[PDB]
């Protein structure tokens, strides 16, 4: 009791000061978790935005490939058109020579 | 004499347990900051990931623009080709 009275006094505030050092940290994690959920929402939205553009590039390659197979036909038709019909005409119209 | 030699027991409990425990609270602050800084690193990565795929779609859009540009002025070449055929096949009207 000679020296104990102080240790009761001293360690109550040592308890009390750390009694509000816990509330401060609790509010620190409850704001650091909210800042985590803001980041999760952004990345999730940006994860789906990237996914939308993924089949946007896929439909483009579906357009490219089918827009090439058409030119493969137009070049093929011009072979018979410009090559056979035209040259034979001018070879048939060689009568003037 | 009695209530003070005992009441220190309920006081040391806070000072010893919370001294170590609040450090575990501090580690979570670093951990939740590490999670925050890791996702923040990813967000810049995905914006760069957006950037390349932003240009990739634009390059695809120019490829469609160039491809239809061929067709637009390759069907015109066929338009004049059939005019040449019909004009030349109009010549055979003079004979037959």
């Amino acid at each position, epitope marked *: 009791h000679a020296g104990v009275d102080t240790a009761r006094a001293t360690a109550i505030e040592r308890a009390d000061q750390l009694a509000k050092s816990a509330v401060a940290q609790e509010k620190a994690l409850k704001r650091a978790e909210e800042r985590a959920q803001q980041l999760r929402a952004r990345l999730d939205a940006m994860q789906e935005a990237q996914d939308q553009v993924r089949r946007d590039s896929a439909t483009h390659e579906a357009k490219i490939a089918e827009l090439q197979a058409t030119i493969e036909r137009l070049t*093929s038709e*011009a*072979a018979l058109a*410009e*090559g056979a019909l035209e*040259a034979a005409r*001018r070879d048939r119209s060689r009568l003037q020579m | 004499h009695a209530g003070v030699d005992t009441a220190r027991a309920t006081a040391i409990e806070r000072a010893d347990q919370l001294a170590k425990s609040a450090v575990a609270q501090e580690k979570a602050l670093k951990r939740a900051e590490e999670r925050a800084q890791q996702l923040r690193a990813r967000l810049d990565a995905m914006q760069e990931a957006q950037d390349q795929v932003r240009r990739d779609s634009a390059t695809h859009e120019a490829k469609i623009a160039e491809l239809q540009a061929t067709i*637009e002025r390759l069907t015109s070449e066929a338009a004049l080709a059939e005019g040449a055929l019909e004009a030349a096949r109009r010549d055979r009207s003079r004979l037959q």
Partner: nanobody
Amino acid sequence: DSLRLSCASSRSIDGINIMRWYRQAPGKQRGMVAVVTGWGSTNYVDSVKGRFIISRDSAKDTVYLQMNNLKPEDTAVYSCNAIYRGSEYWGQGTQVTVS
């Protein structure tokens, strides 16, 4: 004998759309023979098939037009062609005579 006609361009390294090779017999209108497109797809007119082979070369910025088993009737002036940005662009030509 045989020959190899080649055509060197000014841009479009492998971003190559239709490039064509023509020939103009003297006193006669211009005519087409071979078409190679930027994907290696080729076609020839019935007159030259089985003999001529057209082959791209992206790296050299140049398209080729092989001519094998050349016949005396194939003499003409050969102009290489291309379609970039829609409009068509031509070349001077090279009068190849075989006889």
